[PDB]
Swiss-Prot record:
Record's GO cellular component terms: cytoplasm; cytosol; nucleus; plant-type vacuole membrane; plasma membrane; protein phosphatase inhibitor complex
Source species of the chain: Arabidopsis thaliana
Gene this chain is encoded by: PYR1
Positions annotated to bind abscisate: 57, 87-92, 114-120, 139
Similarity comment: family membership: Belongs to the PYR/PYL/RCAR abscisic acid intracellular receptor family.
Protein name as it appears in the record: Abscisic acid receptor PYR1
Length: 175
């Protein structure tokens, strides 16, 4: 369940525009994709909701935002992760929200974990071939490379699961 040459071709321009980074030495990047057999805007409605990432993020326990919270670039959230993980909390600034083009992204700017300078971008993309509408989501990130330990593996495993749960959650709401 990875993207076909055609989906790849269609998404080539989105990758160039939102998922291409100028790396700092000592940093790395990753790109993940997820087909979702559901409508784009449904997917998009969950992805944009920067105050409720628990809706589709596997390992989030709770997420609080400030009083009278309004969703704008520069606003933060404090995420608490579930028990038994090697992280407790994360605090995150929304770096992008384009409802027109369906692009968000955020940076992890503190918390009790070991990701250093993590920033990701998430984009939702509509597909159609004779009466079948479906969605592909792309998510990329940049982080610092890490004696101990193993932040890339953590990041890849977490985004992959979140993308699988996103799909599961949105395909249900397509009820
Ligand atoms: C080793 C089994 C995979 C679990 C390790 C991931 S625990 C974890 C989790 C679940 C995180 O939310 C990571 C989230 C990430 C990388 C992406 C995202 O949430 O979109 C942080 C608290 C920010 C960093 C972190 O360490």
């Amino acid at each position: 369940s990875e993207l076909t040459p055609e989906e790849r071709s269609e998404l080539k321009n989105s990758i160039a525009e939102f998922h291409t980074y100028q790396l700092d030495p000592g940093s790395c990047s990753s790109l993940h994709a997820q087909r979702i057999h559901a409508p784009p805007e449904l997917v998009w409605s969950i992805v944009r909701r920067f105050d409720k990432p628990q809706t589709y993020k596997h390992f989030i326990k709770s997420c609080s935002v400030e009083q009278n919270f309004e969703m704008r670039v520069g606003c933060t959230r404090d995420v608490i992760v579930i028990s038994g993980l090697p992280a407790n909390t994360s605090t995150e600034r929304l770096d992008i929200l384009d409802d027109e083009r369906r692009v968000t992204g955020f940076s992890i700017i503190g918390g009790e974990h070991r990701l250093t300078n993590y920033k990701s971008v998430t984009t939702v993309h509509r597909f159609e071939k004779e009466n079948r509408i479906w969605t592909v989501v792309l998510e990329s990130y940049v982080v610092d490379m890490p004696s101990e330990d193993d932040t890339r593996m953590f990041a890849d495993t977490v985004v992959k699961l979140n993308l699988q749960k996103l799909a599961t959650v949105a395909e249900a709401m397509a009820r």
